[PDB]
Enzyme design. Structure first.
Site, mmCIF file in Angstrom:
data_model
loop_
_atom_site.group_PDB
_atom_site.id
_atom_site.type_symbol
_atom_site.label_atom_id
_atom_site.label_comp_id
_atom_site.label_asym_id
_atom_site.label_seq_id
_atom_site.Cartn_x
_atom_site.Cartn_y
_atom_site.Cartn_z
ATOM 1 N N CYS A 76 15.083 -2.457 15.400
ATOM 2 C CA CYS A 76 15.448 -2.958 16.641
ATOM 3 C C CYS A 76 14.214 -2.503 17.402
ATOM 4 O O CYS A 76 13.115 -2.659 16.777
ATOM 5 C CB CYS A 76 16.641 -2.692 17.340
ATOM 6 N N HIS A 163 20.673 -4.368 13.110
ATOM 7 C CA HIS A 163 21.169 -3.072 12.448
ATOM 8 C C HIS A 163 21.835 -3.062 11.132
ATOM 9 O O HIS A 163 22.851 -3.459 11.257
ATOM 10 C CB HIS A 163 22.092 -2.346 13.695
ATOM 11 N N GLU A 165 22.747 -0.540 9.755
ATOM 12 C CA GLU A 165 23.462 0.822 9.432
ATOM 13 C C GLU A 165 24.738 0.598 10.084
ATOM 14 O O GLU A 165 25.591 1.532 10.164
ATOM 15 C CB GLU A 165 22.602 1.875 10.342
#
Length: 188
Positions: A76, A163, A165
């Site tokens: 991002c 994202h 993660e």
């Protein structure tokens, strides 16, 4: 291990825990940590530039993106910072809101190995890469974002708008795994 520059976003700890989960060590450091201190430790195999709210207060990531001799992943804001660094353009796009985005992988790249050409990723689109830097190419897009992902054609530098993660990104850990593979790790 992977150094994670903490750009102030709320998923920085999910980077550390997702990496650990695939058996990679990592260290969250302030985003003002000089590139020269990161690269003084040969244990550091790669850098992740985390998500965060303000690009002006992540100015130090520009130097790391330009001058690091280690693989980089921008997430991002980190993706946007890499863009700016290499003379690409970044701007407001849609309203602020995290949503499941259907992402299309547009070419065969190391970053998306063992990721289907179509997968759901957790992303905000407050901001986006407007013009991709010279000598970069787009790796993926969605219906609302022309640049869901990009790489430097000749340096090991990777950008994702979303994202990987968070558990809400399908094959997120795989995408992290792939970056770690560029940083010299094997997952047999």
């Amino acid at each position: 291990m992977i150094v994670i520059l903490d750009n102030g976003g709320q998923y920085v700890h999910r980077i550390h825990r997702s990496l650990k989960y695939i058996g990679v060590s990592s260290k969250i450091v302030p985003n003002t940590t000089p590139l020269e201190e990161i690269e003084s430790n040969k244990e550091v195999k790669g850098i992740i530039l985390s998500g965060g709210p303000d690009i002006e207060k992540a100015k130090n990531c520009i130097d790391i993106a330009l001058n690091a001799k280690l693989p980089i992943l921008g997430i991002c804001l980190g993706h946007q910072l890499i863009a700016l660094a290499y003379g690409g353009e970044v701007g407001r796009a849609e309203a602020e809101e995290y949503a499941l985005t259907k992402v299309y992988v547009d070419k065969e790249n190391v970053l998306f190995k063992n990721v289907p050409r179509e997968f759901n990723a957790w992303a905000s689109h407050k901001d986006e890469v407007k013009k991709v830097p010279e000598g970069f190419e787009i790796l993926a897009h969605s219906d609302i974002c022309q640049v869901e992902a990009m790489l430097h054609k000749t340096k090991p530098i990777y950008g994702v708008q979303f994202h990987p993660e968070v558990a809400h990104t399908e094959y997120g850990n795989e995408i992290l795994k792939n970056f770690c593979k560029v940083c010299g790790y094997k997952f047999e």
